[PDB]
Amino acid sequence: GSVSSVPTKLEVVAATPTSLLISWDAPAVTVYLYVITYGETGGNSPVQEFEVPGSKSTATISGLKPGVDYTITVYASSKHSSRYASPISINYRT
Amino acid sequence: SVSSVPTKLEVVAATPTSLLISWDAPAVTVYLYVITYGETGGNSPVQEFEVPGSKSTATISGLKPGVDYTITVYASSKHSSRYASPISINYRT
Amino acid sequence: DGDPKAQTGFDLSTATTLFWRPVPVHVKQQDREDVLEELTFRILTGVAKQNHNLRILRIHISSDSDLFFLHTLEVSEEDFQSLKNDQGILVDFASFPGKIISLLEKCILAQPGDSPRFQAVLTIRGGESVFKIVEINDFKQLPHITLAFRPGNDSVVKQFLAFRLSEVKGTCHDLSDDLSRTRDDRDSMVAQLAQCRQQLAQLREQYDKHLLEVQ
Amino acid sequence: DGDPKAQTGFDLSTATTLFWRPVPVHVKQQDREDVLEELTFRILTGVAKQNHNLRILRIHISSDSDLFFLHTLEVSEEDFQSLKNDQGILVDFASFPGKIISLLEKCILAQPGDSPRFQAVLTIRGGESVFKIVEINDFKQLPHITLAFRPGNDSVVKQFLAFRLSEVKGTCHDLSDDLSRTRDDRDSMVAQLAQCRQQLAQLREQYDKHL
């Protein structure tokens, strides 16, 4: 029973105008690492990626513009997946 | 006209294996502090470590539990004095 | 990433991270009893700063508890041929990290009751180290793969210390900000208990006045 | 010495520290405004790993305020003659660090209203730096001594990073103690106001019952 094991429950638990912290329940497969990509929705904002170890279910993003809707994507690195495969995305407006 | 020595040396926090000491600084400008810890009258080599002058506190680790140690702070104060004007305490964990 | 200086050797900017998570491993020292620490591992593939046509694999063993315990392993494609002939490997350079990560996954998911049970062990001889994955069968502890680790170059150690320092400084800064918020909450709660006790004392005075009226 | 390793040069194990304290210094950059930031200094005397008969003086300028900062200066006994002839020094090699420390102390203890007032200024030119202690009298800003600084080898940077990391770890333990104290005190304030409001409501209810 090999689930694709994408991350579930992607949510922003705490948020301040310049920084937010996201938490996700971990997929059932052993996760090698997580690649979190935060970017502004549309516009000329480049997509920014930073890597977090697989054991961590939380992360923090800083440097955000106030009052702007951002798109946050969590890529999971499983055994039978690619570290830019199996993504799940949410949208949040700081 | 001034002590040029440290004044108040006491143990603020203590754990069975390590100790933390705090001292009030002399009025003169302190260049640095040399903290020397050794076992009391025992054949343990005296261990010295250096701390900046801005620090009024320090921490010593690697101690043997239940053994009375002698801790001395040498001040490198003005007038080029070094390993001089010491203040000493004895404390057992 | 980190403080920019002379980085001749492995180009960390062009690095590609493959594996980065804690994994439980037994550590062997002559003086220290063997301790099961989920040492953090990190596997990276990339190219050298001198030449981009040469591929290089990198493995780092770090310790979130004791951050002075760093060990590194670098493998070039030619050294990969040498290692493949020495240990009898059959896969190519590209599939080497995949098999290493598969063995590490077998190590992490090992339950106390499993046959055969895969485990990881690191023997530390001074600055040097030897890491090996073992199979505990009903018969013997047979080694699957044996790897040697060395102290890192001064540059890679510099940048690793810089990364950890940045993370710890950020954590302490966030905690100090929350403590400022807690001090504001303390001030508000103070003022509130003070006003509440003032009101209660006033009501007691009114009750005493009513009792005097009754008498 | 945290994370030690041997490269042929200055033997930090055999080093003797003479001065290590924060010093107020004006920092000047070509594209940036001049800011008075309290930089930490380090003075070291010792011998080289190659030969113990050769003495070497070492000066480190670090910044506990910023995130990463280190500049180094090495003076050999042979180079000291050149520096002494260039800047017109009169003391010997042994008293050179003593006079440097005396000038630095005169600089730190400088009060806003004093003539002459001693000050220290560091000009950063890309990777290199020029440090000079100056005297501002009623007439002019005359330089007492001028010293040149460059970045450092990877080893000294490694040990500086280790020291900074240890300092931040100690601060984090102090911070955990402070957070325990402050949150327990806030909770105490909450629970006491809650008990007081409960008593106030009870007494008001009793007053309504009696009336």
Numbering used by the authors:
A (entry chain G): -1 to 92
B (entry chain H): 0 to 92
C (entry chain A): 7 to 221
D (entry chain B): 7 to 217
What does the paper say about this structure?
The binding mode was identical to that in the co-crystal with CrSAS-6_N, with an overall RMSD of 0.855 Å. We indeed found examples of CrSAS-6_NL higher oligomeric assemblies with such spacing between spokes emanating from the head domains. Computational modeling based on the CrSAS-6 crystal structures raises the possibility that a helix with a shallow pitch might be present transiently before ring closure.
Centriole biogenesis begins with self-assembly of SAS-6 proteins into 9-fold symmetrical ring polymers, which then stack into a cartwheel that scaffolds organelle formation. SAS-6 proteins contain an N-terminal globular head domain followed by a long coiled-coil, and a C-terminal region predicted to be unstructured. Moreover, SAS-6 homodimers can form higher order oligomers through a weaker interaction between two head domains from neighboring homodimers, with a ~40° angle between the two coiled-coil pairs. Here, we developed monobodies against Chlamydomonas reinhardtii SAS-6, characterizing three in detail with X-ray crystallography, atomic force microscopy and cryo-electron microscopy.
